[PDB]
Design a protein around this ligand. Structure first.
Ligand SMILES: [Mg+2]
Ligand SMILES: [Mg+2]
Ligand SMILES: [Mg+2]
Lengths: 184, 182, 184, 182, 182, 174, 174, 184, 174
């Protein structure tokens, strides 16, 4: 028997179905299994129209303690509030504080070799495809590295409000060491 | 030959069936399990105002609290007067925590599933059901009370007659208890 | 060969040695392995002399979500501050808020079927045996159950200050389910 | 079992992937080949006016002209200010031949591929890429200069910041040349 | 027969050896690894005041930052003038975070090892060493700088001549680099 | 045939010769017009890895040669080298010397009427220090005009970087 | 015997030594008296392949050395090299420097009272750029008289061209 | 049978016992056997308080004649007189007369990579551990070399007197050639 | 494969090249700022073995190179070398010459406007004299400022010492 096409057909048939148990929120999978991940909360600030907002990657206190911990991918789901009226562009890349997101600056990178997600408010429910992910399997990303990165957003039409939405960014990486013996 | 059957199952979910107006499919989550539905006529709820109801198990089940729950579906048969469009979900609760609009959003927007039901003109919204799993969390019948369903009328001042919700509860069959009462 | 005494002799020889790498802090092991634990921080309040202080068990936000999660034991290490001048009695049991630690009330239980740790400040370094543990393997303790419990302390001589010390209470329990697939 | 894999490949191209906003797939045309992209900020171009750029290979490749080219993709990342709608393509050229609107159409309309990019409101146009093959024609790196990309702003007076194009070039890997310069 | 040898090892650690005044044993944490010590004459530090020093790797090692560290022992040879009694340890740092007495305690008291050295009259305190492991955390030579050793003079106004500390660093041997400089 | 395999080697006393460290490695050059930096005044530039590589800070670097093609106008005589560091350290004449006179490399290029002029190439090894692409930024080349104040046009330097070939770039872009 | 086969190699620090790229290859020289080109003024000549070769523009070129026998009168000091291009580009002093200071070769030949004078030979490789005989025309050598204005008689250059042997010339002509 | 632990357990049990036949004088063994040793007498001088006394290694007339004779270790037993009232620090290292034991100088070395013995007068008999030894197996020490070395002492509290004590320093080294034929 | 084993060797006429004696050997460098020693006046420094090595005077030494990184200010021209001796002997100009002109080594480093400057490195062999670490002290390097009086800042010397790797340093300290 040849099972190298069955899987493909099965998974392609799936992912593309408005089955049961779920809002207008797309699907999601997992990177190099044998990995665990960590999510992050990011309520934006009332960012003007044509204005861009961004946040650096600020690892959490318990993981941040293991830089050199490899990252595979990094998904970004965004649960919007009912008050999400605007429509915006969003993505994320490496840095050096040195650079500032002058509207002009942002476009620059937005437009070139790299991924970017658009989230528009549709009055026919709400834009399904609400998450996007990035792969570090190759660039080679250690946990410390994260800080260098940072996600962005650009409010194309409405002056997005802080109450308009909240983003969760999930991070696939190697399991951190599990202690099997009580403290000092 | 498990790949092929898997595709046959998926194709079935995706095809208008001769038993629904627009109400999408709804497979159950357990064998050897029975369920129990609930009726929920929501109080007329203002625009931007939210309505919620605790999980008040009924009289005959409420008595075997040690029984576990797998999942809990929420089908919502709307009345023709259903004009508004709303967001709905449910989670663990602490009474105190109040359904203040602001509070609501808070949770709505984070790790957890939520259903939106809009009144469309070309027939009516399909997926009118949504399910939640308690397997992992480990949920006993008594536990239910802790949880509670919510609703947010995003537009029209949702009317009382605008709709009715049914909450289905998968759990362990209750002992046949073959022995007439008292 | 008979290896049912070797282990015992080896572990008894060990635990009782002022070897290397460690202050006047006793040792520690692990309960039903295949379990993970969780620690808790408890800076006390300036508790008078002859007065007792106590804290209920307030599980954390990520675990508290899985009551019905069995607990094996519960250790209580106490890293004291240099300013730890007093000497105190400490332990922990089940409850019902209904009861209040009237000095008198405390003694009552302190004295009967149950464990209790004394921590005195010695001027010959500091009291080694600084931790104590309790077993729930049998009483059967689920995570929800914890809240019912609560640790206590009684300042026998000095009016213990909040800066005098801080306690960490570690909890052996079953590993919580690990998600292997990114969010909504 | 080559028919089955063929359908699996086709099904894959046709399914939103978790790495694109609306930018359709884009398979490459060669192994043992590497490519090289180019950036093209088009000058603000009037309505009904057309803009074009010759193929100016870069400094480090431009030096191994004997290297052959397979195909050349043209992805175009538009800015949010991208409001216009335009037609674009490219072919062999004779400098003299001038991008006079009229001339343009002439070729546009005949044996050859062309891409149209319109600004839609429901998100944004998908297929933002298009590729051309030089295998047959036989195209050397030097040859590129001969060719040139074009654009026609059918509606808005296409702005400079309205967008940026990237031209990908599949060709033979360049000799590792393991030996530090001069 | 691994149990028996284990007891022989343990018994050895626990027996005055003919090479120490009162300085307890001190086994190393790695093979194929070499270490490097450091000298630390602490500035005279008030009573209740704390002193600290960052990990300033030296000139010849500081150059192979990619080299990993296993553990780091801290032996402290006190002078006869050593009269005070102090607490000492070390951890990751953020410069800013200041050795304000209060800050110190904060960490001292939590998940982490700390050594106390008191001046006794019947000879002198034994265990004068303590070690920390970086295996798990994953520590490169460069990383060291991040960390820093601390001290708290609990009693006497610890004098400069009161003592000297040596910090031993287990890490990967440096390449023989058999090839005279420049 | 380990003898035949190692055989590689070729060079002669002249200003025209240069090998390379490890095969399967590719390199990358850099351009550096200096500044009209004064006499006695030193000029320096950080390692600004370019746009397509700068994306795998984890890739390894073997060597890094620095050839310098001068302009016919180049007249001054200057010392030049490079090392790692923290932006914190500043190229004060005094600071410069400090390092210059260290157990670590350095070239001098002066123009004089004597047969031919010095090699313009010099190279540094990272095969041991262990240098990843990201690491480069930390390093930075320097120069000290011992005599005439060189002008931004008295010369142009090219810095070549041996390192691991970057991703096969398997399939077409975005 | 791959070791014996590769064995070939021989040269020493002096103005008398030169090998060759690939065997089975023959070469062709060229003569180039310059022009009384001014001081600061640059002189250049295109690659005028000769009459019998110029007929197989498809033949491959390996290297191209450029030895230059100067006259005893040669006094000036000059820079010299060569590259490809489009007739369009013009040897303005400024343009010259531009390339001179590129990731691509160059020699300087000055006359001074110091032991012996620089090598007059320099060579360039085409084994990779891939150069066909026709291609030559595109290239062209240059020179810049940094000092004294050299005269058309201050020197004569010979340019040797390694390439594939031309047709066996099997049978007698027309 | 496995006899690689028996010996260890036996010798560890021993050395740590107040058996029979011996004052409050610790024990002692032997270095590379097949070696003989040589002792030295060192009555100190009335060395002030906070003052340090030292003596170079002055090999004896019959051995001193065979420099290049390797030394393994060097023990230093110190039989104190009843009048030993003070308490002192003692050790020993290489030299070059050039250096002088300024109290300050002494500390310097005392505190660093190297052994050091403290001998205090206790009124509960007398400080058992009265000897210390140093190993040259590795540094490689020839008999001539000794002279370079020299032992020291620092009277921490009482102004040690010459009558307060006397030290014997024993030297393990290779047997010197034994003549088996009468003289000239 | 004794041929392949011996194969090791690589160097070219320039101020950038240095091998090493025997493997399994490690070395140790030393720093030596001189003194503002007069013109004609010689300066010297004994071999002050450092603190961690100085403890195995019985360890063997192979070679001992002496590279000298000068400061840009270095102007004087000087002779330099080193040998064993008894503190008794004193560096009087006359005494200096005596040895300088012996069957035993020596370098001269002057600064001049001529292409590049001499190698700064020189090395000495002990593989036969038999030198133990302790022995070093007996030796000592010297210098003679033939012209300008060099200043303690006109230069800094590094002396590298090939010798047997010291004790594996098996287990953690005291
Ligand atoms: Mg790393
Ligand atoms: Mg239960
Ligand atoms: Mg000897």
């Amino acid at each position: 028997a040849l099972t190298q096409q069955v899987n493909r057909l099965a998974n392609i048939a799936s992912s593309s179905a408005p089955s049961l148990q779920h809002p207008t929120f797309i699907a999601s999978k997992k990177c190099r299994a044998g990995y665990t991940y960590t999510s992050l909360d990011v309520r934006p600030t009332r960012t003007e129209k044509d204005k861009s907002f961004g946040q650096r990657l600020i690892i959490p206190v318990p993981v941040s303690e293991y830089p050199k911990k490899k990252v595979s991918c990094v998904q970004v789901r965004l649960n919007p509030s009912p008050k999400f009226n605007s429509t915006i562009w969003v993505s994320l890349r490496r840095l050096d504080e040195t650079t500032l997101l002058t509207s002009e600056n942002v476009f620059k990178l937005f437009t070139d070799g790299l991924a970017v997600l658009i989230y528009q408010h549709v009055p026919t429910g709400i834009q399904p495809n609400n998450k996007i992910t990035f792969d570090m399997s190759n660039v080679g990303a250690e946990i410390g590295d994260m800080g260098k990165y940072a996600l962005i957003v650009y409010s194309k039409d409405d002056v997005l409000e802080a109450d308009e939405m909240v983003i969760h960014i999930d991070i696939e990486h190697q399991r951190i060491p599990s202690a099997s013996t009580l403290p000092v």
